[PDB]
A paper describes a structure:
The eukaryotic clamp loader is Replication Factor C ([name]), composed of [name]-5, belonging to a large family of proteins involved in diverse cellular activities, referred to as the AAA+ (ATPases Associated with various cellular Activities) family. [name] uses ATP to assemble [name] onto primed sites for replicative DNA polymerases δ and ε. The [name] pentamer forms a central chamber that binds 3′ ss/ds DNA junctions to load [name] onto DNA during replication. We show here five structures that identify a second DNA binding site in [name] that binds a 5′ duplex.
We assembled the loading complexes in vitro by directly mixing the purified proteins with a double-tailed primer/template DNA with both 3′-recessed and 5′-recessed ends in the presence of 0.5 mM slowly hydrolysable ATP analog ATPγS. In the open [name] structure, [name] and [name] each bind one different [name] protomer, holding the two protomers 14 Å apart in-plane and 13 Å apart out-of-plane. Because the 14 Å gap in [name] is narrower than the 20 Å width of a dsDNA, and 3′-DNA1 is already inside the [name] central chamber, this is likely a post-entry intermediate in which the DNA gate has partially closed. These open and closed [name] states resemble the open and closed clamp states observed in the T4 phage clamp-clamp loader complex and the recent [name]−[name]−DNA structure. In all five structures, the [name] AAA+ module sits above the [name] protomer (when [name] is present) at the right side of the DNA entry gate (viewing down from the C-terminal collar), while the [name] AAA+ module is above the [name] protomer at the left side of the DNA entry gate. The same 5′-DNA2-binding groove is formed in the [name]–3′-DNA1–[name] (closed ring) and [name]–3′-DNA1–[name] (cracked open ring) structure. The [name] interaction with 3′-DNA1 is similar in all five captured structures.
Residue numbers in the entry:
A (entry chain B): 4 to 323
B (entry chain G): -1 to 255
C (entry chain E): 1 to 119, 133 to 354
D (entry chain D): 23 to 353
E (entry chain C): 6 to 335
F (entry chain F): 1 to 256
The structure:
DNA sequence: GCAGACACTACGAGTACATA
DNA sequence: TTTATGTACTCGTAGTGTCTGC
């Protein structure tokens, strides 16, 4: 068993703030914090895979250098971050006396901060308020709703947005030029379409296509990784002909190996996130999709139930 | 009458042997043979491996013509050993490929007789031929000293790093409270031969281990007066506790990076 | 006690002057009790099913079933909630009801039936109001009576058949209890009053009680006792037919719905419904009474009546699958107001 | 005579199951071999799944090994996710018991033990998901037999792993030999078409037929006239509506007049018949008639189906019956 | 296990022991083999319907990478094992952090049916995967994707296991018949293809039960007739006759025909409903209202049958629904 | 009218410690011959009988027969002051709705008086149908508790197969099986450990687990416990006392 | 050595969340 | 605030063990 090569997701992880693409204003603000040194408490939020925790790690590396071994305390969901056994850890770390450069402070990376309990954040409130001169915190959560409002009242809100296609394409081309793999622009746009602004997904699909076919042409890309089924569901629900919707359902989901419950949940999510049709029509569509969802969850999962769901969706859509 | 008979001199020996590695292992696979009884068992995390072996000299009487694979459960085994007077003479009894074994908790030497039985467990995992190899180092320190050092260092960090270089043993454990650096210089004493820090040297080793697993190792220090540790960069750590007629190893897997 | 409903109850099948065919069938079962299967008596409430059960019990073993005692049993559930439910036990039988909270009566059934099955060969287990079981204790019962049967027997009493699942219907013998005829109601009331000391001008009062009771002998006896107490132990031919205050509230609600069909009247309807649900009333019977009182209003049309009955069926289906009955009842009243307007 | 006729005549051999010939032959030929798959018995109640599995276990091991190599669970027993994760897993991973010389010589003892999960459709999906890999991993030592009367409650992976044996409903043609045998053994005087009526009323089950036969025989013994049990006594004891009352219901429905049908439904429900039986009688009367139009039959079939489903939900049967009759009356 | 093979069901006897023995998923198998020969193995996520060969593929993969004793070098966790967040914090963390105990290789963690893990467990597993990915690879087998955290989905390479096509089932059946000294008629093979519905375990179970069905295991060939009695599925000719009687013949004839077909060999109304659904999907209907009415009414009937009820009323409902739906078309 | 003065405070407490788990409450009946308090468990299976003599436990003065029904939790809470030297005093006046439990200590002058509420029960049935038992067994109670807890930990069902010269205890469970056999052995030097099983008819009865635990909980009442077994009859677990004895009954559940 | 003191692991009851 | 399992967290308590001491 030979030692595995490090995956391109981790091999080409950025180590400096310049390499992170997307959200130019946020990255420039982070760079100005980096050279300025006056890091405030911040909470970083966004959709997964767009570069949240890597910016935190890069900023922690840049602000303080050889002190990175002991000047930063990183915590995560794998560590049992509770109210009692962990309040002492941050209390000691903030109370720990370590000599920094004049404009640098200790960093407490509470990575994946949306999973902590309420009491832990309640203690962290005064923990942050007391030793603000010595230590600074860095929350990195997918969802900022779990963080209580006292924590939001003393933090710098840094909202990341989903990456534009141009930035993903730019960093992808950088990766190709460092790896020297033959590429076609159609294949690259296929990767961009499949990723949906999720960068790690783009890198993983690039890995699979490169190591599966050598060439990243569009046919090989669509052979290896399938198109995202939310788009297929949205296409199916928006069709005007019932026969067309049924054919799309069967061919693209039932013959491709998709569970009925997955189709129902994706249809519910697409309907609630859809905006072209009238609001009320979306309300009855959601009600019918939920009725079919109850039928599926109660035990009867069949192509017939999905076909009936589509038939009634067309009944509401075509206005009787 | 029964094919497999193993009458211990005292139930205390088997109780101590079972309680030595009861905590760190859930499923045990005994393999009785004419040369003795062995037990190769793996932890749930598949990091710590226990290789019990009891020689024929630790049994007052022993006889087992056909090899027997006794896959068992240590929780229920210890529960069975929990009941019964410790002075009593245990006699392990099993049939030809049976569904259970019989624990003769013969009280004193007469009167009360117990027939506790534990249903045999189907463990299809074969024994692992991890005996030994060319180990880089071979040290030997008293069990009490090692247990005290491990217990002291476990409170300071979650990882204990054992370093051997130029006839010197060094334990370091950097953590949040502090960083212990307990060091030992090898020596030998004729006055008290039990306390002697023996050592061998081929190549320096710097291997780190978890704290909870090392505590699990030192829980078994009551069995042996001496513990022998052998380390290598391309081998799991070996902790050979010497018994009255056999031994009890502890193949611990070091961390990487 | 001084109540006449529990003072004159036929102890034996010989005193069951109610149904000749049903008494003969029960006597046929009691003829050879060595192989008596599990029973399930169904019919309108107030018919006297429990009376037949006790009469059959004393015909199987002998006198002494009618002596009863109370034995509170402590039962523990998930977490440490305490819902100690008493059992009305006795020699030769055992009487249980699912008066405990419906979500966790399954444990009551499980451990109590397992405890009684640890051993005159069998002890009958009467389960009053079996239609209130929540399809979970019935699942336990499926194998409970099937596995242990030579030691335990069930007389499963329920006033409705629909909530009882198919296997329970399959493994239990079905016995039908029709409601009394009006002539039989009058005869029973006449026997009670001649054993009592109430003076009657004419037996037309007994017939009026029979008509108003709608085949329910228990409420018939209760109303006769109330009238006799109110009429100074001398019934009057012009005495008004007294109704339960619940019936009065339902009829006033129906009148308010019929006359005023605005949102405000729906607010007072909701308040009245809140009071009625606070007054220990099941949702099925209140919706049934509201529906049948609405259909008895003469100013309605046949189309409105059909719409009302169809939405009543729909919302009764909703009651059978819902938790908070107030929302379903308010929705039914809203639909009725929409149809009538 | 210490037991009811349902359990007194419960089959004790695999050949005694006088229905489901395919499943019984498959299980017998498997009994000759040792390749017993993970079974999944399903079908209507009373078709004989529990009897079949008990007979199969008894013929496989014998009376001595029932307590050692059989683990039966019910909804009466606690069947949470913890029970599936610990009790079932432990019993599965234990080795098989030791067969004696007598058991091995007389019975075809196989080297596995069967875990019977009766009424398994009541378990939560999480427990079944936990049971999946327990079923898969220890296949060489234990067999799982899932006995549920509803397939849809069993999740897809278990239906994939388990071999399915549908237990067909026992109609008049399939299960007339059993009733004739029971009548011969119990000396029950019977008419010519009485057993056909019993099997017709007992919709797809034999336990109900046996119970009805026992009740009719007990009544005949009480009367003691030595008279053959007619179809009338069985029809009355079965709880089905007599034809006169059904004709009256149809006559009231045909004329309309909501007040009249409401009054007659009130009186009918006062007499207290089971509404499911009334719906069944109305279905077998209206559909089989030839005096009604095609469109009427379509609409009345849909109405009867909707009423039957609503009754099966467990609702107040009076309102459902009145609604069905009024909807039919306006056709 | 006991008595080696020949005492196991055909489901667990014919389990692939090599990546070459997995049929159908040619692209996935070839990509995985290329991955392991080139030395790179990212975090794999196998998604697909039941019976498509996910856990068989990953077991064959672990057997190929490691030695015969793959279970000594792989921490394979399933829903039977407790997988709380404490388990992730202790067992997974210790297995990922430490070095291999039997040889020199990367740790491999296989999480079969990982969709049953809680949200907090997946949240911890996120950082556990991302931190110790240098010498530890995670494989996640999930039938359902909606139960997986999107963070977990964005971390593992997604491989989709399609339902088995005709050729793969035919090849596996040919291998099984060659091994078992059994003969089977091609029409029976086509019936098995239609009965499988993309599942392989169903095929193996039906073959086992049909071999048990035959009086003489040798000599006699398995025809589609034996398939149809052994599985109990309706024959296509029966479905065609029932549908023709419903469409053209009147209520007396259609009801009598359906009752006779059901009572001939104990058919159930279920499997017959979706047999009729397949046949009607094989039709062209001018009016969409016919399709709408058919789908809605048949779904309601199938739901009611799933909840159980009276079979006669449900059969009458099926006939009425079909006959009312094919009169709005004209 | 009731003057049940008790010599030791932590003696009636020792008795109610055993009384606590056998039954929730008892209906006391005090007579000049002795104190009897029998109660029926919630299952109507386990029967507890109480008998207290007059020679010991200080002077007993029961002028009138008094029947009192009260709980044991509050009684234990009041008796928590159970010093080795403290005594007890029971006083019941006319309409004794609140019994005053006087504490007087010989070693110290400190006094303690508390009032116990009385609930309205007025229900007590005393019937001892059987006295003849096939097998009478005396053995130390601590060993009985030990063997019962060891067998009940392994299995939930306990059966006894009394044969010639063997008092066989067998416990079959899913985990395993425990078959402990004790022989009648009497040492004149150690009366407590002496074991005698009188033999008239062999007894094979299958018992439970929680009932056996409740029985063995009161092991400290007697050094030697009298165990009586009768075929097809309720068991009798008689615990001796300095003045009187306490016997426990149980139905031998059996379904084969 | 027996007694107290000591801090440790183990156990039980209570609360709060459950889709983005 | 009822809901009704399963999960996870937190605290509190009861013993159980080895460690100092006279
Ligand atoms: N803007 C970016 N520029 C370059 N690489 C990026 C960028 N965003 C993400 N990546 C790549 O994404 C991988 C890791 O992304 P992460 O920042 O760890 O994901 P994340 O933002 O933390 O989302 P979650 O919530 O943790 S799953 C590495 O391979 C990075 O190279
Ligand atoms: N094929 C059969 N042959 C003979 N008796 C049968 C048959 N099927 C059912 N029975 C009778 O049905 C009774 C018990 O059947 P069961 O096996 O309990 O039905 P079931 O499969 O358990 O239905 P459930 O569990 O309620 S879904 C006995 O009286 C049997 O004699
Ligand atoms: N492609 C295939 N080639 C050959 N046999 C297959 C194939 N797919 C499935 N099988 C058979 O199906 C049996 C069970 O399927 P598995 O692959 O073990 O489980 P699975 O397909 O992952 O389904 P789940 O999701 O785990 S329930 C195996 O033992 C094989 O005999
Ligand atoms: N044959 C009878 N003669 C006189 N009264 C009867 C007869 N049968 C029943 N009853 C009356 O019925 C009442 C009991 O009804 P009950 O069994 O409670 O009905 P339900 O079981 O529907 O609640 C008794 O008060 C009794 O007087
Ligand atoms: Mg991150
Ligand atoms: Mg059954
Ligand atoms: Mg799998």
């Amino acid at each position: 068993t030979l030692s595995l090569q490090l995956p391109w997701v981790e091999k080409y992880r950025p180590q400096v703030l310049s390499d992170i693409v997307g959200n130019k204003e946020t990255i420039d603000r982070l760079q100005q914090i980096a050279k300025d040194g006056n890091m405030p408490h911040m909470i970083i939020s966004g959709m997964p895979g767009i570069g949240k925790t890597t910016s935190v790690h890069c900023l922690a590396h840049e602000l303080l250098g050889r002190s990175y071994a002991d000047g930063v305390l990183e915590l995560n969901a794998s560590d049992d971050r509770g109210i009692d056994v962990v309040r002492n850890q941050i209390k000691h770390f903030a109370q720990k006396k370590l000599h920094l450069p004049p404009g640098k402070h200790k960093i407490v990376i509470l990575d994946e901060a949306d999973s902590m309990t309420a009491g832990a954040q309640q203690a962290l409130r005064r923990t942050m308020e007391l030793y603000s001169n010595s230590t600074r915190f860095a929350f990195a959560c997918n969802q900022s709703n779990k963080i209580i409002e006292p924590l939001q009242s003393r933090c710098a809100i840094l909202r990341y947005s989903k990456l534009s296609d141009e930035d993903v394409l730019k960093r992808l081309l950088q990766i190709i030029k460092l790896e020297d793999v033959k590429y076609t622009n159609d294949g690259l746009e296929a990767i961009i379409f499949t990723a949906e602004g999720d960068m790690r997904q783009a890198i993983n699909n690039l890995q699979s296509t490169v190591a599966g076919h050598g060439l990243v042409n569009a046919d090989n890309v669509f052979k290896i990784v399938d198109s995202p089924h939310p788009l297929i569901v949205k296409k199916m629900l928006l069709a005007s002909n019932l026969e067309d919707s049924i054919q799309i359902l069967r061919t693209d989901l039932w013959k491709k190996g998709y569970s009925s419950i997955d189709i129902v949940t994706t249809s519910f999510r697409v309907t609630k996130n859809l905006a072209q049709v009238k609001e009320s029509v979306r309300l009855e569509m959601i009600k019918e999709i939920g009725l079919t969802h109850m039928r599926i969850l109660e035990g009867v999962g069949t192509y017939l139930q999905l076909a009936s769901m589509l038939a009634k969706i067309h009944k509401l859509n075509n206005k009787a | 009458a029964s094919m497999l008979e193993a009458k211990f001199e005292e139930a205390s020996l088997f109780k101590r042997i079972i309680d030595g590695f009861k905590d760190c292992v859930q499923l045990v696979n005994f393999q009785c043979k004419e040369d003795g009884i062995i037990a190769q068992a793996v932890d749930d995390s598949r990091v710590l491996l226990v290789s019990l072996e009891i020689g024929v000299e630790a049994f007052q009487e022993y006889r087992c013509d056909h090899p027997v694979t006794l896959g068992m459960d240590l929780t229920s085994l210890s529960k069975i050993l929990r009941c019964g007077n410790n002075t009593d003479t245990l006699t392990l009894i099993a049939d030809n490929t049976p569904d259970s074994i019989i624990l003769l908790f013969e009280d004193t030497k007469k009167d009360r007789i117990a027939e506790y039985s534990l249903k045999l467990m189907d463990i299809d995992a074969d024994f692992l031929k991890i005996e030994e190899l060319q180990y880089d180092s071979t040290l030997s320190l008293p069990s009490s000293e090692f247990s005290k050092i491990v217990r002291d260092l476990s409170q300071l960090s979650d990882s204990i790093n054992i370093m051997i270089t130029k006839e010197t043993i060094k334990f370091v454990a950097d953590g949040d409270i502090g960083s212990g650096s307990v060091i030992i210089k090898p020596f030998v004493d004729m006055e008290h031969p039990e306390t002697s820090i023996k050592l061998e040297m081929d190549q320096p080793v710097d291997l780190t281990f978890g704290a909870k697993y090392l505590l699990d190792i030192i829980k078994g220090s009551s069995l042996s007066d001496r513990v022998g540790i052998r380390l290598s960069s391309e081998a799991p750590a070996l902790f050979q506790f010497d018994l009255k007629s056999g031994f009890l190893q502890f193949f611990l897997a070091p961390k990487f990076n | 006690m001084s109540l006449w409903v529990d003072k004159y109850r036929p102890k034996s099948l010989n005193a069951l002057s109610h149904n000749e065919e049903l008494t003969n069938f029960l006597k046929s079962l009691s003829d050879q009790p060595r192989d008596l299967p599990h029973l399930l008596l169904y019919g309108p409430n107030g018919t006297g099913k429990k009376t037949r059960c006790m009469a059959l019990l004393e015909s199987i073993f002998g006198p002494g079933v009618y002596r009863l005692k109370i034995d509170v049993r402590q039962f523990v559930t998930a977490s440490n909630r305490k819902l100690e439910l008493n059992v009305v036990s006795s020699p030769y039988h055992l009487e249980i009801t699912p008066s405990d909270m419906g979500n966790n009566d399954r444990i009551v059934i499980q451990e109590l039936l397992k405890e009684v099955a640890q051993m005159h060969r069998y002890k009958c287990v009467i389960i009053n109001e079996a239609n209130s079981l929540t399809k979970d204790a019935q699942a336990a019962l499926r194998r409970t009576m099937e596995k242990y049967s030579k030691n335990i027997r069930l007389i499963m009493v329920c006033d409705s058949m629909s909530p009882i699942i198919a296997p329970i219907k399959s493994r239990c013998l079905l016995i039908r209890c029709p409601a009394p005829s009006d002539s039989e109601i009058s005869t029973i009331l006449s026997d009670v009053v001649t054993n009592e000391r109430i003076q009657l001008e004419t037996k037309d009062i007994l017939k009026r009680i029979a008509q108003a009771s709608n085949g329910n002998l228990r409420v018939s006896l209760l109303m006769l006792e109330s009238m006799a107490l109110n009429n100074e132990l001398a019934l009057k031919s012009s005495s008004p037919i007294i109704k339960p205050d619940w019936i009065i509230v339902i009829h006033k609600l129906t009148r308010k719905i019929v006359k005023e069909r605005s949102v405000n009247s729906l607010i007072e309807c909701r308040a009245v419904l809140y009071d009625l649900l606070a007054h220990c009333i099941p949702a099925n019977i209140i919706l049934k009474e509201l529906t049948f009182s609405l259909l008895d209003v003469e100013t309605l049309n046949t189309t409105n009546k059909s719409s009302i009955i169809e939405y009543s069926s729909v919302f009764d289906e909703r009651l059978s699958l819902g938790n908070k009955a107030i929302f379903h009842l308010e929705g039914f009243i809203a639909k009725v107001m929409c149809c009538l307007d | 005579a210490q037991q009811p006729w349902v359990e007194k005549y419960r089959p004790k051999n695999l050949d005694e199951v006088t229905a489901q010939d395919h499943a019984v032959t498959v299980l017998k030929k498997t009994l000759k071999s040792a390749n017993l798959p993970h079974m999944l018995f399903y079908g209507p109640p009373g078709t004989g799944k529990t009897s079949t599995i008990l007979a199969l276990t008894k013929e496989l091991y014998g009376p001595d090994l029932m307590k050692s190599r059989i683990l039966e669970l019910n909804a009466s027993d606690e069947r949470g996710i913890s029970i599936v994760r610990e009790k079932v897993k432990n019993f599965a991973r234990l080795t098989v018991s030791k067969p004696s010389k007598h058991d091995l010589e007389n019975y075809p003892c196989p080297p596995y033990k069967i875990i019977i999960l009766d009424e398994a459709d009541s378990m939560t999906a999480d427990a079944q998901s936990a049971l999946r890999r327990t079923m898969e991993t220890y296949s060489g030592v234990t067999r799982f037999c899932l006995i549920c009367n509803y397939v849809t409650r069993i999740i897809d992976p278990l239906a994939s792993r388990c071999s399915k044996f549908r237990f067909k409903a026992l109609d008049a043609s399939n299960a007339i030999d059993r009733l004739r045998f029971i009548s011969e053994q119990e000396n029950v005087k019977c008419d010519d078409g009485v057993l056909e009526r019993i099997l017709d009323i007992s919709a797809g089950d034999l336990r109900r037929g046996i119970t009805l036969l026992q009740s009719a025989s007990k009544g005949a013994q009480y009367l003691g006239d030595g008279k053959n049990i007619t179809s009338t006594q069985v029809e009355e004891l079965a709880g089905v509506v007599p034809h006169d009352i059904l004709i009256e219901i149809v006559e009231k429905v045909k004329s309309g007049d909501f007040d009249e049908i409401k009054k007659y439904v009130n009186t009918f429900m006062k007499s207290g018949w089971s509404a499911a039986s009334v719906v069944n009688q109305l279905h077998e009367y209206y559909i089989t008639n030839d005096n009604f139009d095609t469109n009427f039959k379509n609409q009345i079939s849909w109405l009867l189906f909707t009423t039957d489903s609503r009754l099966n939900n467990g609702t107040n049967e009076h309102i459902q019956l009145l609604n069905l009759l009024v909807k039919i009356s306006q056709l | 296990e006991k008595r080696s093979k020949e005492n196991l069901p055909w489901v667990e006897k014919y389990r692939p022991e090599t990546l070459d023995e997995v049929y159908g998923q040619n692209e996935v198998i070839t990509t995985v083999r290329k991955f392991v020969d080139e030395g790179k193995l990212p975090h794999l996520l196998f998604y697909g319907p039941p019976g498509t060969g996910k856990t068989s593929t990953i077991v064959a993969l672990a057997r190929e990478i490691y030695g015969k004793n793959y279970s000594n070098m792989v921490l394979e966790l399933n829903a039977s094992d407790d997988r709380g967040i404490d388990v992730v914090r202790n067992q997974i963390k210790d297995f990922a952090s430490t070095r291999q105990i039997f040889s020199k290789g990367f740790k491999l963690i296989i999480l079969d049916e990982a969709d049953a893990m809680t949200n907090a467990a997946q949240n911890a597993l996120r950082r556990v995967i991302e931190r110790y990915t240098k010498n530890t690879r995670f494989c996640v087998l999930a039938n359902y994707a909606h139960k997986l955290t999107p963070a977990l989905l964005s971390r593992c390479t997604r491989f989709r296991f399609q339902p088995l096509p005709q050729e793969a089932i035919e090849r596996r059946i040919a291998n099984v018949l060659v091994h078992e000294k059994l003969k089977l008629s091609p029409n029976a093979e086509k019936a098995l293809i239609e009965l499988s519905n993309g599942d392989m375990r169903r095929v193996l179970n039906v073959l086992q039960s049909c071999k048990a069905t035959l009086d003489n295991p040798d000599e006699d060939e398995i025809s589609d007739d034996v398939i149809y009695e052994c599985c109990g599925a309706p024959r296509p000719s029966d479905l065609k006759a029932v549908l023709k009687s419903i469409l053209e013949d009147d209520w007396g004839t259609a009801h009598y025909t359906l009752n006779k077909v059901r009572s001939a060999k104990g058919l159930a109304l279920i499997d017959l409903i979706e047999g009729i659904v397949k046949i009607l999907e094989d039709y062209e209907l001018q009016n969409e209202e016919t399709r709408v009415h058919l789908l809605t009414k048949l779904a309601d009937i199938e739901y009611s049958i799933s909840k159980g009820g009276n079979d006669q009323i449900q059969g009458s409902a099926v006939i009425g629904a079909i006959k009312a739906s094919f009169e709005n078309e004209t």
